[PDB]
Subunit: 152 residues, 3 copies
């Protein structure tokens, strides 16, 4: 984990919570070292500094129901001074133009979303990566649904 | 604020700028730090070193118009020795592959392009980050379209 | 001398290669410095450290072929101890979900995929960026196909 004292975290999702996004620590490379902690599913940040922040979510859907599927992935900082979630990153993705699988019943889409960004954080700040539809989460984990920061 | 004696920058798209990607700092994490000067929509490099150049843009539209759009996102370098715009990171994105939609016309689409990599820049060379279709830019989320650097 | 004594890499994909992914520095914005070396198209890691490993591949295909194409992109660390491929990072996009374009010959789609994470390697490791379909890449690219590792 340490060498290089950097707050570092690279945390994997969890292929047990049937539809959810539980972050997991210890898998082959799931760095939670020196300073940063995961506490209620968030990366609590030590030090103070400019953290490079990243995550990827893989949404997986067999077919498309009537009405917009519209997926979303955000990373928000909950500040401990003037608190609350301040929005840092998120991206929107619509994986179906009207098709809506009757005919040749349900054949799959795959939608990766990846976020990356260098932000100034502060000692003790909490970090959230959330999706709006944990039903569409694929399972085959390590490099497929992940989250991380490193201090630069 | 400032940690480190690193040049950093994280500028954002002016949301009130009709049809042009125009950068901005002053905002949330809209850093211009140690010697990075933003100029004619571009970033002038202060120091010889590796920089991490990242950028994200978002594209929205509602319905898919005539047949073939192509959204492009390119970060370029107009360098202090090969003084010309060479090309650093680039992505093309096809929004809708048809619908054109007429039975029920404008259902919304959102495409996120993100870009980023380590390069060895020099003092004085500019970095540019344009998109070919500013009309397709989203300006309802700020944690969306930006451009930043940071020496490593 | 102040380039940097940091292991760094940024290889671009070679344009003269039919359906294969050949990585190449000795190119205009491709680094390889401080003992990293690209040996059998893979990256060998010089010292123990924490490394940001990132990767982008562009795919274009005109028309949407039958059944389901599925394009993948992953980075594997091929170790020094249990030295076979362990998947560090992975994404999967499917570009065609029906279209089959019959009385048409059809439109071209573009599909990019970005991969970036922080991982702890060990000395002598190898890292490989492998797509499942090289026959679908695109190279009037400058930054569209890349592989880079930087030591944090």
């Amino acid at each position: 984990r340490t060498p290089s004292d950097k707050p570092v975290a690279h945390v994997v999702a969890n292929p047990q919570a049937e539809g959810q996004l539980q972050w997991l620590n210890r898998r082959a490379n799931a760095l939670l070292a020196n300073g940063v902690e995961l506490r209620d599913n968030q990366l609590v940040v030590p030090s103070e500094g400019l953290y490079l922040i990243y995550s990827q979510v893989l949404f997986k859907g067999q077919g498309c129901p009537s009405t917009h599927v519209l997926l979303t992935h955000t990373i928000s900082r909950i500040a401990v001074s003037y608190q609350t979630k301040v929005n840092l990153l998120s991206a929107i993705k619509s994986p179906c133009q009207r098709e809506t699988p009757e005919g040749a019943e349900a054949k799959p889409w795959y939608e990766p979303i990846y976020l990356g960004g260098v932000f100034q954080l502060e000692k003790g700040d909490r970090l959230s990566a959330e999706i709006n539809r944990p039903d569409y989460l694929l399972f085959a984990e390590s490099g497929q649904v992940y989250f991380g920061i490193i201090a630069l």
